Amino acid sequence: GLDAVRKRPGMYIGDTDDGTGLHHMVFEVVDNAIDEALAGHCDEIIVTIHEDESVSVSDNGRGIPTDIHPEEGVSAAEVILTILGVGVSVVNALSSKLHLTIYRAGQIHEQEYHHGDPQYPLRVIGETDNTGTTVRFWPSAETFSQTIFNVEILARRLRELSFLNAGVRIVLRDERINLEHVYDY
Ligand SMILES: Cc1[nH]c(C(=O)Nc2nc3c(O[C@@H](C)c4ccccc4)cc(C(=O)O)cc3s2)c(Cl)c1Cl
């Protein structure tokens, strides 16, 4: 039901004009990585503001499940990204593009979406000794009247999450000003 999200984004992500809803897009992805840390699976989260104005969030948790979901006939990861915290499916719906990478059970999986529509089924692209999830997303300029992330707004929330989740190392990178901050209680 991502149609409803695109039609009334304010109801799902908050104010699309004043910067709050825009930064909520990053916070929703980070909150999924924090849940992975609370469960004891993740101890490092890297949040990057890219030169292209996109944001990536990488965790070293379990990685989103990749096995086919019986009811849906597609990867569990696709079901989580494409069917309605508000959930990462809201971030996907309101992103012109989203790139998902999963490191799980010795394999690297990827899927790309445009406005929440998968471009191809989740595919294995290589081998890895690591586990975790990376989401890179480009917020839709059709939804958000401002799409430029403020490193100070992200920094304040990441500092809070670092404090509240001691033992998670949170790295904030802003490629636009070559900034890196490490939050580790
Ligand atoms: C940056 C980032 N990281 C994650 C992330 O790691 N999420 C993971 N979710 C699971 C998991 O629950 C799935 C089936 C589920 C997700 C939402 C609601 C209900 C169910 C199950 C398992 C498992 O059984 O191994 C592992 C994971 S890891 C997300 Cl989402 C985002 Cl965004």
Residue numbers in the entry: 29 to 112, 131 to 231
Article, verbatim:
Bacterial DNA gyrase and DNA topoisomerase IV (topo IV), both type II topoisomerases, responsible for the ATP-driven introduction of negative supercoils into DNA and ATP-driven supercoil relaxation and decatenation, respectively, are validated antibacterial targets. Gyrase is a heterotetramer of GyrA and GyrB subunits (A2B2), while topo IV is a heterotetramer of ParC and ParE subunits (C2E2). We have developed compounds with a promising activity against Acinetobacter baumannii and Pseudomonas aeruginosa, which are both on the WHO priority list of antibiotic-resistant bacteria. Cocrystal structures of 1 in complex with Escherichia coli GyrB24 and (S)-27 in complex with A. baumannii GyrB23 and P. aeruginosa GyrB24 revealed their binding to the ATP-binding pocket of the GyrB subunit.
